[PDB]
């Protein structure tokens, strides 16, 4: 809602998907390497969601 | 001015530390030498005053990193200037190939008396009008000034030619009328000229009507011209014959070359400076701009292209049934779209008026190229697919309408390849230049006159249509600036005396007399016991006079060969599916 | 920097191994690697930025999101496709229109397929389409507005340049820009956002305290004027009030080059396109003194240089105010232990911290002996080695840090004490400074006219910057003209209601119909505002004063020449353009040298700016000088001006004394070479015509 | 003629122009050497590169001696080979290849005469091209008697 | 009052070349600079500026001024 | 042929904006007059501005004052656009003190006798309950624009800090021309110049000063001849 | 607050009619104000007198030929407008020129009426072949600045009479250039150089004195708003 200041949009087509976490490339990779709580949390979230993921850490 | 360069305070003060110290001790501003060092390090005002006193009459060589050809290093008169960047004269910038996007240029200091003498005489920025590559002006760039001159010497229809069809007693009253707004700069009118105004070269045979002898070559004469052409000519020196034709870029180079040939260097520099000032002023007034309504896409485009699309989809339909092979479909579609883009290019060319800014700054030769406007207004056309292929579906939208996503992607396919090719070609060009300079050394002019008479046969005039003689299309790079080994007699009378460099007048006379070939002396046949003689090499091209003994012809030749290596950037558009052909 | 994919590295494609194929784009690089942006140097294309929607396959491949299509009906389901799985299916284009129902409006739809083919396939045959048109463009390139109208080359240069804009004193978000700058700013780590949804209790410049409803109190400390890696300030402002409610992830404090959580890499200036007296020739730039006057383009710069009190074999080094062989006033602003006070303006040569060598074997020279006897001064073994501000510098010190060996702090071996001082200045925009816009149009400032010389508009507003029109046709980036017109439109609001026009209908349905003056406007990178929209809004701009619109329907305006005073002969294009202050500042580039440090193995001057380095007279320079026939200048530039130890002192003495320059000797590098080829068992002997030679 | 025309059309394809003398100097340089054939009377090796001036000199010597001249055929080779096979070993060593040229310079015991340009840029002496020539640099200066009479 | 103040064409036609002009004017400039730095020996050989001189000047400007006036002459050994 | 001398009439459109009409000008004369008037009205007008300041416990502009959400540099930017009228030809000192929570503004600054702040509604900063702002300001008088670099003259007073100052109190000028109703081919034009200036001074005396400067320049040109 | 260096107009004369005027170092950016205002006022404000119409004997407006004269009518128009006349009647006045026989008719042979003076009798107006036959009457009228030719209906009143363009300004042209100069170690000083070309009638310096007086009046009209002081000298 109040995430950003109001900016008039000239866009014509609605976008279903939102931009992901733009820094996911580094943070998720190192999360996987450490194998800390975050990596295993994402692993179990993917498993219960059915999404494939390496379930062994780095 | 043409021989001036600006040096920020800090750089000038640091470059000239020994000289500023000597001047400070001599004027007693500083007690002793060490105190002078301390005072300059402090940077008190008297130090800057002494600096302003000491830099003048001391040349400094400005020099850019690539230094492709000998105009890379150029001497200048320094000049203190506030700020922190070198100030340079826009005329000499194109000699350096030095743009002002962002560009650093080194400053070197001639130290000895001989060194500064050389920088005064040889390397001076005003004695190098002519580029040594082919002997043409290089010190009249065109980005902005030439647009001003073109807008200045322009025929009617550039505006509503109000105040047209009248005569004015002298250019002064015409100018007054121009400020009044009744007259416009672009409007044909009859203008007087005071005595001494040398008239148009084609105006000479015509004259006024009288029963007594008259000499209009150097007295008053009315002339139907424009106020703009009057201003342009009064920029040029009085002795120069009047110019009544639009200047653009080619004719400006022509007149600059004529000035460089027939006038002294100082007059050439002053004329260039006047041309510069007027060009900037009248480009400011020219009102060239760019806007959304400036670039108007041709109306016909959409219709024609959809017609093509119909044909195209029809072809696609008869490819869906297997009636045509895929390769044949690709080739015929490529031909179809080449035809379409040629047709739309012609339609856009017809549509755009002569008064719009883009037309003014592309016709004049200021900057740009007609295909760039083609793909700004008309559709881009066929774009090369990766590893030198052609896509079947060219881009149908111009940059004004905005390309599509896949269209933008397939355009980047060629853009990045162009970048990489440019980089590789500059590397190879540098290597070639080094090799040419390194083989070409040792060849210095070490003799005034050859011992021999043997010459080289050259074709003076070719492609002579039936019942007429036509000179060679590329006569300039071949036979100009060469010395005839021996005289020529065609009607039993001598036409071109031996050992004279060739210009326009002699070439025209010899062609008119109908000779088909000439025996021009050249370095190949040169028979010199020591190196090569000056006359065999003929006149230099950066000076317009006979090559002085001892000049380095080898280095100049190698640099002239190597300079456009970066400019070539030409490659086969498509391999065509065959290798080695 | 985070998202780059450096192809260069160990066990991979090195710079030498590069060919034509690797650099060139591939049809696969769509949603996986931005083709527009890359370094333009020799490593062109080898390094590229990850696409906006890119994600990493666990095996290391890159995926991209695609929507699902079934029986001609695109669904609201997404699948992630790698570079191989994308080949089998036929993928549509997001730009393809869609009907009121979820089905395609047009049977004919653009599609792409195996091998990068772009052929069309009408009707229900596709299965996957791009989810957003900005899939193929990275963040930097996605920032540019009206990208589609620019050439690929200029968009490449504009992406490379946008990564060099320095933060300013006061940052302002673009009036016209992509709608994505908010995400780019927020996900960047510079900005400080809340981890709890509570109410702020104490707002202050240094820190901000918040209280979640649970009870936890958290205070965020805002960095203030701390040097970044590039010697630029990271000053962080505060936006939230005292009693305003907060939500998780909401933004509290801006970062460098940010505003209300929106990226702001520069300011937006009023631009008019016209040649102006040649001061903007060859793409140089003319801007008002208003920017110098109002600090519109001004950036803080913090330099940090440090010195260490190490112990040598003679003894320890002392950091003391009692530096030897100095005057009294030089050490005026120093502290007790010999440290410059905080807040004391410095200049070139000023003493930051006073350090003295322990001692050294001093054999007083006879002249020094006599002079010391005369003045009764005792030349002491302790020698001055204090830190001084390098030449060509200015600034107010903002902080000093001291670390002591004997204290609990740890230091490397030997260094008893270490001192770091911050010198911070406020560099204003000046001549020579490099400026540039978003669309790869860059130029050095060439003149800053007073506010009056600026050709002003019908209501007296001077134009803040002049740019040469000659750039845009050849540069093939008419996107900047579009941006200028839309910036003018954003600055002056517009009202569109009941106009019944096609563009009016599109604006009304989009919701961007009634826009007040000043509010920002967003044009996505590939769904920008059509030129019809710009034309219509230009017709229907809000009257700024007296009920008249200063810009004609053509998008141009009447410019009154400030100097002469007369109106310019024809209207001129004007609007608001976003410019950036690059980091290619003149102050850092400037460098001169009378005489300075010399190298060791070969006695020629050494290189670089930090060490008073003379410019290199390369091979092509001597080639050009030979081409002129100038031989004596070459002799001096090779022997007197470097590479001859005997001649340099002699020439300095002759210049200072006024005596004529002496004859050059032989260079030192030649003797280095003859000695080296003597040590390869080649008896390289220099001989004269009449027997042995004299050297 | 063929080389001049070919390279000129290659340049003109883009649109750039250069004068033909620039090309002609290089072309004369490439053609400078001659391959000796039938080296019977000349007593040197057959089938190796030899400078044109050297060829004419040795032919004059042998014909004056009464021996029949050894034949030769003009040979064209690239700029690189021409540069490497030069009389001044220092200039060639300053070119791209250093080890081989230095090695054969040592084995041949060839003294590098200082005539030319690059090697006189190595030594720091004055290049013999332009202001460095003997005839320009030997002049002496003194005003006229009337100048002193005036003052 | 400038580098280009003495125009070059007269100097070329005087000295018949351009390099010879540079070296000859350089020799003259060296001589005048040596005279100006005599500081008291008063060697009879040295000759001061023939043309008028400013209070502070470069030797080479005066040398080229003398060449333009033409009163100075050269002679190759 | 007809002789008609210029005549000036004035009208007000706002408390600080006025329009001035000069009808009998010659053809092609109004534009140049309006331009020269604008050039001198923006360049040289006498005004007052803050040239330097002092803050307790602050040694340079970079640091921050505890208790105020805007860093000192933001305070420089805020005061820099403060508009003042100073009658003392010498520098004057003003004091700004504020304790407790609230918005410190240009209204609460202490005006010395003869120096007046003219934009009291401006907001300079906001203080917290714990905060405390003390500030000394130096007001000088001049014309044009002067950067902080040349305004620094005290070195030992490390607490003092200079600020770039702007003296000109005029905001903008816009001139236009028309055609007079008199029936002649000359078509004498009516120059109308609209001046809007800051709250410091009425535009009337601003243009009075501009006219004084220009008339003095042209009188210098005239009298030195003949 | 006071100007660092006061200006001082100075003159440089190369011909009796051509002149150059230099202003010493001046406040920054003031060069263009003074330069262009001076140009326009010097070109327009100074009053003068020049011909307004010409009448040839025995010709029609459409009939561009004149019998008995080798030259045509348009060159005659150029020549007459070239000629300078000093008049003070404040109303239209007429001048006559009647000459016969072959020869050359010049401004010297023109007979001026009372109170009108021709300044340059050297100009040759026309050349005659055979019988000159020339009879001519031209109208002079004082005025200000510059005005283009218009129809007054004089042609309808008399067929021979035709309009002609006029040069009321005593000056022919002003070319002003502003350059930079360095004073007290500061380069923020602009020198104005104004080159004034004027006809032989009136000296340029007096003309610019009149122009400066006019500008002084026109800008001191602004003193009436209020009394204020600005730094000077
Ligand atoms: Mg560049
Ligand atoms: Zn020869």
Per-residue H/E/C for B350-392: HHCCCCCHHHHHHHCCCCCCHHHHHHHHCCCECCEECCCEECC
Q: Which of residues 33-62 of G touch C (CB under 8 A)?
A: 36
DSSP letters, C636-693, are IIIIISSS-HHHHHHHHHHHHHTPPPPPP---HHHHHHHHHHHTTT-----B-SSSB-
Chain G residues with CB-CB distance to C453 below 8 A: 29, 32
CB of D19 less than 8 A from some CB of E: no
B144-286 CATH? 1.10.274.100
Q: How far apart are CA G232 and CA F217, in angstroms?
A: 9
C666 to chain E, minimum CA–CA distance in Å?
A: 22
Backbone φ, ψ for residue D95 (5° rounding): -85, -165
Reduce the DSSP state of residue D100 to 3 states and report it.
helix
Q: Which residue has 């004091």 as its token pair?
A: F95
G228 to chain B, minimum CA–CA distance in Å?
A: 35
3-state helix, strand, coil in chain A (%, to 5): 40, 5, 55
Kindly tell me the burial class for residue B389, based on how many C-beta atoms sit within 10 Å of its own C-beta (0-12, 13-18, 19 or more).
Answer: middle
State the number of CA atoms in the 13 A half-sphere of G220 facing the CB: 11
E49 to chain D, minimum CA–CA distance in Å?
A: 10
Kindly tell me the burial class for residue C490, based on how many C-beta atoms sit within 10 Å of its own C-beta (0-12, 13-18, 19 or more).
Answer: buried
Resolution in A: 3.7
Q: Are C50 and C140 in contact (CB under 8 A)?
A: no
Q: Are G92 and G142 in contact (CB under 8 A)?
A: no
Q: How far apart are CA B442 and CA B437, in angstroms?
A: 10
Of the candidates G199, G161, G195, the one whose C-alpha atom is nearest the C-alpha of residue G178 is G195
Within B186-299, where are the H helices?
Answer: 227-235, 250-262, 265-286
Spatial CB neighbours of G114, under 8 Å, sequence gap ≥ 6: none
Q: Which residues of C touch E (CB under 8 A)?
A: 629, 632, 657-660
Q: Are G32 and G193 in contact (CB under 8 A)?
A: no
- Pairing outcome for strands B60-63 and B106-108: antiparallel
Q: How far apart are CA C538 and CA C488, in angstroms?
A: 9
Can you read off the two tokens belonging to residue B235? 């920029």
Q: CA C248, C253, C259, C263: dihedral to nearest 10 degrees?
A: -70
E13 to chain D, minimum CA–CA distance in Å?
A: 16
Best residue in G26, G27, G28, G29 for a mutation probing chain C (most C CBs within 10 Å): G29
Backbone φ, ψ for residue C462 (5° rounding): -75, 150
| Long-range contacts, stretch F105-110, CB < 8 angstroms, 24+ apart | F106/F82, F109/F137
CA distances from D31 to B443, B524, D52, D84 (A): 14, 10, 9, 15
Can you read off the two tokens belonging to residue C472? 């845009």
Angle at alpha carbon of residue C669, lines to C667 and C674, rounded to 5°: 105
Can you read off the two tokens belonging to residue C257? 């080059």
Give the H or E element holding residue B214. none
Angle at alpha carbon of residue B562, lines to B561 and B566, rounded to 5°: 130
Q: How far apart are CA B531 and CA D32, in angstroms?
A: 12
Q: How far apart are CA C34 and CA D125, in angstroms?
A: 55
Kindly tell me the burial class for residue B228, based on how many C-beta atoms sit within 10 Å of its own C-beta (0-12, 13-18, 19 or more).
Answer: buried
Reduce the DSSP state of residue B347 to 3 states and report it.
helix
Residues in chain E: 77
CA distances from A44 to A37, A52, B499, C59 (A): 11, 10, 95, 18
Q: Which CATH number fits domain B299-420: 1.10.132.30, 3.10.129.10, 1.10.10.10, 1.10.510.10?
A: 1.10.132.30
Give the H or E element holding residue B443. none
Backbone φ, ψ for residue G50 (5° rounding): -155, 160
Of the candidates C63, C95, C94, the one whose C-alpha atom is nearest the C-alpha of residue C79 is C63
Asked if C660 and E30 come within 8 Å (Cβ–Cβ), the reply is: yes
Q: How far apart are CA B171 and CA D70, in angstroms?
A: 80
Q: How far apart are CA D2 and CA D11, in angstroms?
A: 14
Q: Are B518 and B484 in contact (CB under 8 A)?
A: yes
- Pairing outcome for strands G134-144 and G161-163: unpaired
Can you read off the two tokens belonging to residue F56? 């307790």
Q: How far apart are CA F24 and CA F4, in angstroms?
A: 6
CB of C434 less than 8 A from some CB of A: no
Measure CA of the first residue to CA of the last residue in chain G; give whole Å.
10
Q: How far apart are CA B386 and CA C28, in angstroms?
A: 12
3-state secondary structure B513-560: HCCCEEEEECHHHCCCCCCECHHHHCECCCCCCECCCCCEHHHHHHHH
Spatial CB neighbours of F34, under 8 Å, sequence gap ≥ 6: C565, F173, F175, F176, F177, F191, F193
Reduce the DSSP state of residue B59 to 3 states and report it.
coil
3-state secondary structure C76-87: EEEEEECCCHHH
Q: Are G73 and G64 in contact (CB under 8 A)?
A: yes
Q: Which residue has 């001093």 as its token pair?
A: C362
Q: How far is CA A39 from the centre of its chain?
A: 12
Q: Are F85 and F115 in contact (CB under 8 A)?
A: yes
Q: CA C13, C15, C20, C22: dihedral to nearest 10 degrees?
A: 30
Q: How far apart are CA C693 and CA C686, in angstroms?
A: 7
Q: Which of D102, D123, D131 sits opposite C629 (nearest CB)?
A: D131
Q: Which residues of B417-429 are buried (b: 16+ CB within 10 A; e: fewer)?
A: bebbeebbbeeeb
Of the candidates F66, F50, F45, F36, the one whose C-alpha atom is nearest the C-alpha of residue F164 is F50
Q: Are C121 and C39 in contact (CB under 8 A)?
A: no
Spatial CB neighbours of F123, under 8 Å, sequence gap ≥ 6: F78, F103, F104, F105, F106
Backbone φ, ψ for residue C100 (5° rounding): -60, -45
Which 8-state DSSP code applies to residue C491? H
Q: How far apart are CA C423 and CA B86, in angstroms?
A: 27
Best residue in C629, C654, C660 for a mutation probing chain E (most E CBs within 10 Å): C660
Angle at alpha carbon of residue E18, lines to E16 and E20, rounded to 5°: 75
Q: Which residue has 């407790």 as its token pair?
A: F100
- Pairing outcome for strands B60-63 and C62-70: unpaired
Q: Which residue has 């070349």 as its token pair?
A: E17
CA distances from C186 to B30, C193, C249, C262 (A): 60, 8, 9, 8
Of the candidates B192, B148, B155, B147, the one whose C-alpha atom is nearest the C-alpha of residue B173 is B192
Chain B residues with CB-CB distance to D29 below 8 A: 439-440, 443
State the number of CA atoms in the 13 A half-sphere of C452 facing the CB: 25
Which 8-state DSSP code applies to residue B494? B
Q: Which of F38, F152, F174 sits opposite C452 (nearest CB)?
A: F38
Q: How far apart are CA G88 and CA G111, in angstroms?
A: 17
Q: Is B115 left (phi over 0), alpha (psi -120 to 50) or beta?
A: alpha
B447 to chain C, minimum CA–CA distance in Å?
A: 16
Backbone φ, ψ for residue B105 (5° rounding): -130, 130
Q: How far apart are CA C574 and CA C558, in angstroms?
A: 9
The experimental method behind these coordinates is cryo-EM
Q: Are C112 and C135 in contact (CB under 8 A)?
A: no
Q: How far apart are CA B33 and CA B26, in angstroms?
A: 10
Can you read off the two tokens belonging to residue F21? 């009409």
Q: How far apart are CA C80 and CA C581, in angstroms?
A: 39
Measure CA of the first residue to CA of the last residue in chain D; give whole Å.
63
Q: Which ligand is nearest to the CA of B451?
A: 2
Spatial CB neighbours of E38, under 8 Å, sequence gap ≥ 6: E46
Torsion over CA: B192, B194, B200, B205 (sign): positive
For chain A, the chains sharing at least 3 beta-carbon pairs closer than 8 angstroms are: C
Q: Are C632 and B114 in contact (CB under 8 A)?
A: yes
Of the candidates C482, C459, C460, the one whose C-alpha atom is nearest the C-alpha of residue C544 is C459
Q: Which residues of C199-229 are buried (b: 16+ CB within 10 A; e: fewer)?
A: ebebbbbbebebbbeeeeeeebebbbbebee
For residue E30, give the chain C residue with the closest CA: C660
Q: Which of C202, C452, C566 sits opposite F42 (nearest CB)?
A: C452
Spatial CB neighbours of C14, under 8 Å, sequence gap ≥ 6: C8
Give the CA diameter of chain B: 101
State the number of CA atoms in the 13 A half-sphere of C513 facing the CB: 16
- Give B101 Cα–ligand 1 centroid separation in angstroms: 6
Spatial CB neighbours of F208, under 8 Å, sequence gap ≥ 6: G222, G223, G225, G226, G227, G228
Measure CA of the first residue to CA of the last residue in chain E; give whole Å.
35
- Give B97 Cα–ligand 1 centroid separation in angstroms: 8
In chain A, how many H helices and how many E strands?
2, 1
- Pairing outcome for strands D71-74 and D33-37: antiparallel
Can you read off the two tokens belonging to residue E12? 């070329």
Which 8-state DSSP code applies to residue C432? T
Give the H or E element holding residue C441. none
Reduce the DSSP state of residue C214 to 3 states and report it.
coil
CB of C450 less than 8 A from some CB of G: yes
Q: Are B196 and B215 in contact (CB under 8 A)?
A: no
Can you read off the two tokens belonging to residue D138? 């030997």
Q: Which residue has 């009449």 as its token pair?
A: C690
Can you read off the two tokens belonging to residue B554? 């080898």
- Give B527 Cα–ligand 2 centroid separation in angstroms: 5
Q: Which residue has 């002019």 as its token pair?
A: B445
Within B43-135, where are the H helices?
Answer: 45-55, 90-96, 113-121
Q: How far apart are CA B189 and CA B161, in angstroms?
A: 11
Give the H or E element holding residue C3. none
């Amino acid at each position: 809602a109040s995430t950003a200041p109001l900016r008039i949009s000239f866009a014509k087509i609605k976008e279903p998907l939102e931009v992901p976490n733009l820094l996911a490339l580094q943070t998720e990779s190192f999360d996987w390497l450490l194998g800390n709580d975050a990596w295993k949390a994402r692993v179990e979230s993917a498993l219960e969601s059915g999404q494939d993921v390496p379930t062994k850490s780095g | 001015k043409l021989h001036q360069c600006g040096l920020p305070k800090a750089m000038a003060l640091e470059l000239f530390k020994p000289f500023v110290m000597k001047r400070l001790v001599d004027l007693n501003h500083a007690q002793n030498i060490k105190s002078a060092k301390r005072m300059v390090e402090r940077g008190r005002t008297v130090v800057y005053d002494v600096l302003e006193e000491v830099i003048a009459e001391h040349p400094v060589l400005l020099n850019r990193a690539p230094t492709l050809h000998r105009l890379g290093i150029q001497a200048f008169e320094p000049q203190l200037v506030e700020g922190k960047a070198i100030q340079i004269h826009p005329l000499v910038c194109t000699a350096f190939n030095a743009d002002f996007d962002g560009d650093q240029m080194a400053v070197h200091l001639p130290l000895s008396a001989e060194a500064q003498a050389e920088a005064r005489i040889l390397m001076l920025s005003s004695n190098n009008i002519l580029k040594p590559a082919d002997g043409r002006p290089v010190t009249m760039p065109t980005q902005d000034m030439v647009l001003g001159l073109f807008f200045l010497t322009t025929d009617s229809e550039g505006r509503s030619p109000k105040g047209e069809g009248r005569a004015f007693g002298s250019s002064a009253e015409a100018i007054m009328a121009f400020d009044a707004g009744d007259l416009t700069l672009q409007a044909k009118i009859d203008i007087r000229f005071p005595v001494g105004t040398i008239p148009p070269r084609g105006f000479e045979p015509p004259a006024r009507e009288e029963g007594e002898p008259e000499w209009q070559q150097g007295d008053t004469f009315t002339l139907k011209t424009t106020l703009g052409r009057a201003l342009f000519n009064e920029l040029l020196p009085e002795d120069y014959p009047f110019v009544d034709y639009e200047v653009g870029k080619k004719q400006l180079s022509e007149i600059v070359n004529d000035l460089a040939e027939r006038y002294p260097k100082v007059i050439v520099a002053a004329t260039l400076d006047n041309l510069k000032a007027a060009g900037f002023f009248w480009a400011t007034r020219s009102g060239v701009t760019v806007a959304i309504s400036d670039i108007v896409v041709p109306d016909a485009k959409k219709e024609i292209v959809k017609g093509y699309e119909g044909q195209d989809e029809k072809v696609q339909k008869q490819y869906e049934r297997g009636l045509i092979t895929k390769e044949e479909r690709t080739q015929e579609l490529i031909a179809i779209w080449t035809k379409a883009t040629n047709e739309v290019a012609e339609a856009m060319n017809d549509n755009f008026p002569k008064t719009n800014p883009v037309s003014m700054m592309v016709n004049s030769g200021a900057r740009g190229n007609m295909m760039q406007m083609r793909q700004i207004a008309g559709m881009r056309g066929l774009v090369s697919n990766a590893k030198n292929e052609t896509i079947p579906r060219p881009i149908k939208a111009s940059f004004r309408e905005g390309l599509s996503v896949l269209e933008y992607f397939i355009s980047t396919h060629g853009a990045r390849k162009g970048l990489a090719d440019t980089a590789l070609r500059t590397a190879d060009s540098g290597y070639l230049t080094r090799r040419l300079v390194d083989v070409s050394q040792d060849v210095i002019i070490r003799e005034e006159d050859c011992g021999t008479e043997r010459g080289l046969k050259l074709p003076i005039a070719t492609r002579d249509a039936d019942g007429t003689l036509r000179k060679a299309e590329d006569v300039e790079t071949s036979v100009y600036a060469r010395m005839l080994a021996e005289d020529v007699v065609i009607d039993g009378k001598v036409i071109a005396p031996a050992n004279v460099d060739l210009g326009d007048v002699l070439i025209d006379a010899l062609v008119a007399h109908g000779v088909e070939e000439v025996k021009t002396r050249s370095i190949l046949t040169c028979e010199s016991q020591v190196g090569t003689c000056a006359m065999c090499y003929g006149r230099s091209l950066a000076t317009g006079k006979l090559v002085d003994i001892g000049e380095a012809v080898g280095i100049i030749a190698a640099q002239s060969i190597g300079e456009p290596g970066t400019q070539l950037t030409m490659r086969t558009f498509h391999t065509g599916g065959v290798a080695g052909d | 920097h985070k998202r780059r994919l450096n192809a260069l590295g160990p066990g991979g494609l090195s710079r030498e191994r590069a060919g034509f194929e690797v650099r060139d784009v591939h049809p696969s690089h769509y949603g996986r690697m931005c083709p527009i942006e890359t370094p333009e140097g020799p490593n062109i294309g080898l390094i590229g930025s990850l696409a906006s929607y890119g994600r990493i396959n666990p095996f290391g491949f890159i995926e991209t999101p695609y929507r699902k299509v079934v029986e001609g009906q695109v669904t609201d389901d997404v699948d992630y496709l790698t570079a191989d799985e994308e080949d089998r299916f036929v993928i549509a284009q997001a730009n393809a229109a869609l009907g009121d129902d979820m089905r395609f409006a047009e049977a004919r739809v653009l599609v792409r397929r195996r091998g990068g083919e772009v052929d069309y396939v009408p009707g229900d045959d596709v299965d996957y389409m791009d989810v957003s048109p900005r899939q193929m463009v990275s963040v930097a390139t996605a920032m540019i507005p009206f990208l589609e109208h620019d050439d690929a080359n200029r968009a490449l240069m504009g992406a490379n340049m946008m990564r060099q804009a320095v933060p300013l004193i006061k940052s302002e978000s673009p009036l016209v820009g992509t709608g994505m700058e908010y995400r780019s700013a927020a996900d960047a780590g510079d900005v400080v956002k809340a981890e709890k949804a509570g109410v702020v209790q104490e707002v202050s410049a240094d820190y901000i305290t918040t209280t979640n409803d649970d009870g936890t109190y958290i205070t965020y400390r805002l960095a203030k004027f701390s040097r970044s890696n590039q010697g630029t300030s990271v000053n962080q402002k505060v936006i939230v009030a005292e009693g305003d409610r907060i939500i998780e992830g909401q933004v509290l404090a801006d970062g460098p080059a940010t505003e209300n959580g929106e990226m702001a890499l520069g300011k937006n200036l009023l631009v008019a396109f016209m040649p102006w007296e040649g001061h903007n020739y060859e793409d140089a730039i003319i801007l008002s003194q208003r920017l110098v006057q109002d600090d519109v383009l001004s950036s803080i710069h913090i330099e940090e240089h440090e010195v260490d009190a190490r112990d040598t074999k003679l003894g320890p080094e002392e950091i003391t105010r009692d530096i030897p062989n100095v005057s009294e006033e030089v050490l005026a602003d120093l502290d007790e232990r010999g440290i410059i006070r905080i807040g004391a303006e410095v200049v070139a040569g000023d003493i930051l911290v006073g350090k003295v060598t322990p001692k050294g074997e001093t054999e007083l020279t006879p002249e020094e002996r006599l002079l010391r006897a005369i003045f009764g001064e005792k030349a002491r073994e302790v020698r001055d080695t204090s830190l001084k501000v390098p030449h060509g510098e200015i600034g107010k010190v903002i902080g000093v840090r001291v670390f002591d060996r004997e204290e609990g702090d740890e230091l490397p071996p030997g260094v008893n004490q270490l001192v770091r001082v911050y010198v911070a200045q406020k560099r204003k925009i000046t001549d020579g400074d490099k400026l540039a816009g978003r669309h790869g149009n860059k130029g050095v400032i060439s003149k800053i006219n007073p506010i009056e010389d600026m050709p002003f508009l019908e209501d007296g507003t001077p134009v803040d910057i002049i740019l040469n029109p000659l750039a845009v046709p050849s540069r093939m980036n008419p996107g900047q003209v579009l941006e200028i017109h839309l910036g003018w439109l954003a600055s002056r609001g517009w009202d569109v209601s009941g106009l019944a026009e096609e563009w009016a209908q599109r604006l009304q349905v989009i919701g961007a119909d009634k826009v007040e003056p000043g509010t920002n406007v967003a044009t996505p990178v590939f769904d920008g505002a059509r030129e019809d929209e710009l034309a219509g809004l230009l017709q229907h701009t809000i009257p700024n004063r007296d009920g008249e619109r200063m810009v004609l329907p053509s998008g141009k305006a009447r410019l009154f020449d400030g100097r002469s005073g007369e109106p310019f002969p024809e209207p001129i294009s004007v609007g608001y353009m976003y410019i950036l202050k690059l980091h290619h500042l003149v102050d850092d580039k400037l460098h001169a040298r009378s005489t300075g440090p010399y190298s060791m193995i070969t006695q020629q001057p050494l290189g670089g700016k930090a060490q008073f380095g003379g410019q290199r007279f390369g091979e092509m320079e001597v080639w050009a000088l030979e081409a002129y026939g100038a031989a004596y200048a070459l002799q001096e530039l090779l022997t007197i001006k470097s590479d001859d130890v005997t001649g340099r002192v002699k020439v300095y003495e002759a210049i200072v004394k006024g005596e004529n320059i002496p004859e050059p000797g032989i260079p030192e590098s030649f003797k280095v070479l003859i000695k080296e080829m003597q040590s390869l068992c080649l008896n390289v002997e220099v001989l004269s015509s009449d027997g042995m030679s004299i050297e | 003629v063929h080389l001049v025309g070919e390279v000129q059309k290659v340049y003109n394809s883009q649109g750039v122009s250069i004068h033909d003398k620039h090309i002609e100097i290089i072309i004369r340089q490439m053609l400078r050497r001659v391959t000796i054939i039938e080296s019977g009377d000349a007593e040197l090796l057959p089938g190796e590169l030899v400078e044109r001036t050297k060829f004419e000199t040795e032919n004059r010597r042998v014909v004056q001696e009464g021996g029949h001249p050894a034949s030769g055929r003009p040979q064209l080779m690239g700029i690189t080979k021409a540069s490497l096979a030069t009389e001044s070993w220092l200039s060639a060593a300053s070119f791209q290849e250093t080890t081989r040229v230095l090695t054969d310079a040592a084995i041949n015991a060839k003294s590098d005469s200082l005539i030319g340009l690059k090697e006189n840029v190595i030594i720091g002496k004055l290049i013999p091209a332009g202001t460095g020539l003997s005839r320009y640099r030997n002049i002496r200066v003194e005003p006229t008697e009337e100048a002193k009479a005036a003052m | 009052e400038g580098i280009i103040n003495p125009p070059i064409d007269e100097l070329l036609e005087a000295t018949d070349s351009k390099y010879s002009l540079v070296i000859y004017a350089a020799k003259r400039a060296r001589q005048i600079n040596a005279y100006y730095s005599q500081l008291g020996e008063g060697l009879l050989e040295y000759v001061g500026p023939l043309v008028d001189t400013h209070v502070h000047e470069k030797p080479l400007s005066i040398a080229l001024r003398e060449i333009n006036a033409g009163l100075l002459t050269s002679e190759a050994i | 042929l007809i002789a008609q001398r210029p005549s000036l009439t004035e009208e007000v459109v706002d408390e600080f904006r006025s329009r001035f009409v000069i009808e009998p000008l010659e053809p092609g004369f109004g534009y140049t007059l309006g331009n020269s008037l604008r050039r001198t009205l923006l360049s040289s007008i006498p005004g007052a501005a803050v040239t330097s300041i002092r803050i307790d416990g602050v040694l340079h502009e970079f640091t921050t004052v505890p208790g105020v959400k805007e860093d000192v540099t933001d305070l420089i930017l805020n005061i820099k656009q403060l508009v003042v009228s100073s009658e003392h030809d010498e520098p004057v000192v003003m004091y700004l003190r504020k304790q407790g929570p609230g918005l410190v503004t240009a209204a609460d600054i202490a005006p010395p006798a003869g120096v007046e702040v003219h934009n009291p509604d401006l907001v300079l900063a906001t203080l917290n309950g714990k905060g405390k702002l003390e500030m000394e300001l130096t007001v000088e008088r001049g014309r044009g624009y002067v950067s902080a670099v040349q305004n620094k003259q005290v070195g030992q007073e490390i607490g003092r800090i200079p600020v770039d100052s702007i003296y000109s109190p005029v905001l903008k000028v816009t001139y236009k021309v028309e055609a007079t109703r008199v029936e002649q081919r000359t078509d004498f034009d009516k120059l109308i110049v609209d001046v809007e200036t800051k709250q410091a001074m009425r535009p009337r005396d601003a243009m009075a000063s501009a006219g004084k400067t220009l008339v003095e320049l042209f009188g210098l040109a005239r009298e030195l001849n003949i």
